[PDB]
Amino acid sequence: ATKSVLFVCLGNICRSPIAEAVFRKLVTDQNISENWRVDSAATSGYEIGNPPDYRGQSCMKRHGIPMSHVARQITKEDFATFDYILCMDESNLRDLNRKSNQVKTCKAKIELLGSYDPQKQLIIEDPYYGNDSDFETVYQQCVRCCRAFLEKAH
Numbered sequence: 312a313t314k315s316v317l318f319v320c321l322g323n324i325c326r327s328p329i330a331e332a333v334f335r336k337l338v339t340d341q342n343i344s345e346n347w348r349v350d351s352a353a354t355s356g357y358e359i360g361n362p363p364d365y366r367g368q369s370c371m372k373r374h375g376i377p378m379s380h381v382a383r384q385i386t387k388e389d390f391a392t393f394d395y396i397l398c399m400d401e402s403n404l405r406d407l408n409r410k411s412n413q414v415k416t417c418k419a420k421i422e423l424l425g426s427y428d429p430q431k432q433l434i435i436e437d438p439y440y441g442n443d444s445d446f447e448t449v450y451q452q453c454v455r456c457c458r459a460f461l462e463k464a465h
């Protein structure tokens with residue numbers, strides 16, 4: 312379009328780097344990655360500079376999905392440049408809305424990624440203190456939500 316989407320979670324080391332990687336693969340598989348700007352960022356500064364939690368890498372390797380990212384915090388600019396900001400839970404959503412009201416230009420539509428899930432699992436829960444099966448759940452949620460978002464944005 313070019314179209315753009317920013318996936319957001321608390322740390323940008325587990326949920327949103329997986330979502331970003333899943334989405335980039337989907338558009339690359341459909342020959343339209345050049346039409347999309349895809350990224351991920353954190354609401355917080357807890358993990359800035361760090362790559363995805365290696366448990367998430369292990370999950371993505373199993374599914375054949377390339378993932379390469381260094382954590383960064385969302386900035387005021389992101390609200391002006393992204394068409395969609397898709398986040399994981401209600402705390403992310405609250406924080407993003409708070410930040411968005413501090414800027415003059417907010418192009419982005421800010422929503423829960425789970426609002427796209429055909430299976431209606433609204434919240435994508437933080438797997439950091441969970442186990443490998445929690446990362447797998449997060450992955451599967453991202454696949455379903457990302458596919459539906461690409462098909463038709465709200």
Ligand SMILES: O=C(CS(=O)(=O)O)Nc1nc2ccccc2s1
Nearest residue numbers: 320321322323324325326357439
């Ligand atoms: O970073 C993530 C996961 S994700 O938001 O990247 O999916 N979860 C955190 N839990 C904590 C808990 C304590 C301190 C810092 C952090 S960071």
